[PDB]
C-alpha cells in the first residue's frame, strides 16, 4: 500500500505497509529434465564406433524420451522417495491446496 | 528476462565397470557377439507423439 | 563363488573420461567422449553418466 | 524371509507369488509374495 505517489519522506509514508514477496523455488528439474537434448534432430546425440562412424542413436521427434523415463521410474520403483544423485524428486502438489 | 544464467565448467563421463573374471568376461563377450544374442530393448512409453 | 567371477588382475571400478572435442555455444554445449571399454570387460550403460 | 524356490542339484527361483493384473482382488485368491 503506497499512500503517496510523490517521492521523498512525508508523514503519509508512515502508513505504507510492507508485504513479503512470493516464494520462488528455482532449481533443476526432476531427473534432470531439460539438460540433455533428447528428440531434437538438430542436436542428436552420438554413440558410434570410432572407425565405422555410423551413429547407433537414431532419434526421432515424435519420441518422448523424457516422459518414457518418467513413467518407467513409476513402474519399477517407489516414486515418492527422493534420490539426490539423479535429482530424482518427483513433482508433487499439496493435496490440501489443490482440493480445498 | 529474470537474469538466471547457467554456465558449464567441465563435463566428465564416468563409467562403472563390474570387475568380471577375464575368461568369464571373454566367454560372455564371445556369446554376446552373435547375431542370435543381440540385446533388444523397448522404449517404455512406446508411442508416437503428435 | 571363488573362481571365474572376479578378476585377479588390476582393473578400475570407475573410470574418468575427459572430452575429446568439446564445443561451447551461447545456446548449447557439446561434449565428445571416447567411451573406451577395455578388453575382458563389460560396461552396462546404466552405470554411465555425465 | 526367502523368495520361492524350485529344486530341479541346482536351486532355481520360482515365479510364484508375483504381482499380476487380475479382475478380482488377489488377496482373496492367492498369497502375494
Amino acid at each position: 500500500y503506497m499512500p503517496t505517489i510523490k517521492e521523498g519522506n512525508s508523514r503519509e509514508l508512515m502508513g505504507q505497509q510492507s508485504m513479503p514477496n512470493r516464494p520462488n523455488y528455482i532449481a533443476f528439474r526432476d531427473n534432470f529434465i531439460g539438460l540433455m537434448y533428447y528428440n531434437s534432430t538438430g542436436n542428436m546425440g552420438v554413440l558410434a564406433g570410432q572407425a565405422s562412424q555410423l551413429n547407433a542413436v537414431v532419434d526421432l521427434q515424435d519420441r518422448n524420451t523424457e516422459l518414457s523415463y518418467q513413467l518407467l521410474l513409476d513402474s519399477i520403483g517407489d516414486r515418492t522417495r527422493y534420490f539426490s544423485m539423479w535429482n530424482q524428486a518427483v513433482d508433487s502438489y499439496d493435496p490440501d491446496v489443490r482440493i480445498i | 528476462v529474470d537474469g538466471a544464467s547457467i554456465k558449464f565448467d567441465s563435463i566428465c563421463l564416468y563409467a562403472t565397470f563390474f570387475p568380471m573374471a577375464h575368461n568369464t568376461a571373454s566367454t560372455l563377450e564371445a556369446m554376446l557377439r552373435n547375431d542370435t544374442n543381440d540385446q533388444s530393448f523397448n522404449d517404455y512409453l512406446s508411442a508416437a507423439n503428435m | 563363488p571363488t573362481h571365474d567371477v572376479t578378476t585377479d588382475r588390476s582393473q578400475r571400478l570407475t573410470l574418468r573420461f575427459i572430452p575429446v572435442d568439446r564445443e561451447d555455444t551461447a545456446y548449447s554445449y557439446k561434449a565428445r567422449f571416447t567411451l573406451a571399454v577395455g578388453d575382458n570387460r563389460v560396461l552396462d550403460m546404466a552405470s554411465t553418466y555425465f | 524371509p526367502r523368495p520361492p524356490v524350485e529344486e530341479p542339484a541346482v536351486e532355481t527361483v520360482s515365479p510364484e507369488g508375483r504381482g499380476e493384473k487380475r479382475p478380482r482382488p488377489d488377496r482373496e485368491e492367492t498369497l502375494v509374495t
Binding site: 513402474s75 | 517404455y44 | 563363488p1 571365474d4 567371477v5 | 524350485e6 542339484a9 536351486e11 532355481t12 527361483v13
Partner: peptide, 29 residues
C-alpha cells in the same frame, strides 16, 4: 553349466529362473 558362478545356498547353486531372462515392461501393456 556356469553353476560355479552362482552363490551356493547350501551345497547347491542358487541359479535363477529361465523365464526371467527377458523383459516385457511397456507403458500400458
Amino acid at each position: 553349466n556356469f553353476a560355479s558362478l552362482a552363490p551356493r545356498h547350501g551345497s547347491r547353486p542358487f541359479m535363477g529362473n529361465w523365464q526371467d531372462i527377458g523383459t516385457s515392461n511397456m507403458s500400458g501393456g
